[PDB]
Amino acid sequence: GDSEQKRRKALKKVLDAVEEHGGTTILSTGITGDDARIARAAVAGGARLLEPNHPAVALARGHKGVITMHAAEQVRHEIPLDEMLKVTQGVRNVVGEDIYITVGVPGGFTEILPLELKEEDFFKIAMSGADGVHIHKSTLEDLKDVVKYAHKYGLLVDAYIGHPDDLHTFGISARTPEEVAEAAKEMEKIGVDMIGLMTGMSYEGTAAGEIHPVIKERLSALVSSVKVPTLAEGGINDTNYVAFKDTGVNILVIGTSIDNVVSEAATNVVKKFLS
Template structure:
């Protein structure tokens, strides 16, 4: 069962790994004022307890702005804090299995790199696709670049929303605005910005969403 209200994926903020909660909350709140529409909490190196505590704090903040919280990988954390959804990669639990574990209406996002993976993710119950890495990125060391044209192809072969991710910043975001994507996911373009609100606003303007 799909959500009746599909989220606005236009400017999707992914958190920086291991950022202190206080800094994260401050940046997220500022970025929302600039136009961020979805926030994903991504933590690879902290304990389950710390992940839960950070997710709980972030969920409380996002609820006050009616912004959906997506949890990266950890279905247990997503369920525990009542997040809007979970996002998984190709090396995580299979999307079909994840879909069975999630309650009706909870979002499932799946990372893909090629059209075939996108088609499979949609068939397995994904609500949206994260397509990348679109550009070279320093945020995720193991991220592989997509083939030229793959982003447009992925948008053509699925009916669910596609969010571009990977190295997206103010200098290149406009180049993907006509690819058919529902939005762009960014990390450092906002988290490392001197003014996260201005950075978010500019990104959204350049994307034309």
């Protein structure tokens, strides 16, 4: 069908990028996800997968004066779905059909206020040009509902595993490496198209250039448990990128580190013009 051919083309984009980049590619997010100028710039640097999302758009629009990612996360559900549809379509307009776009929308994460996505909304997301939805729901039953509607409208789902003690949940809870593997396998059976692990916790005593052994072991459990493409999201920067890649995970979700470099470039050029 039409949904079917669409999803097959979309997965090929992801598989091609993984291959092109030697087994690990990047899901470029933050400002590269929502601003059409910077999305194009990211693609010019080799990015093949982009992720516009609602907290980043809150930051871009100065929603409620938020100036940190953390503050933006707390108001992300206030960004209307229509705004994400406009952003997604705008980015698609400029990067063309070969780039992969997965969108974070209000109601697509575990929100702090219960926004329910309706079937209608998945149709709208597909009509806006997204290839997928970036999902941080925190129960398997919620993921089943998301997968059903996403697949109906020709969208792929990338969804995540987190830790039960996370202050703000960003996925299916897994306390131990064994539970990470079990959660990944269940998510694969449900039909989640790409499965990731939240890896952003900062540990005391992490050796320079390395990832903390707790995270590495959790990632290993994900990487070796499923056949679908795997992701790591959170805490990835240029000092530990290779350490993340060494785990064999297929996609590194990178936003903050890129935001920081782009922001600093702007600060420095203004500083130069003024001096």
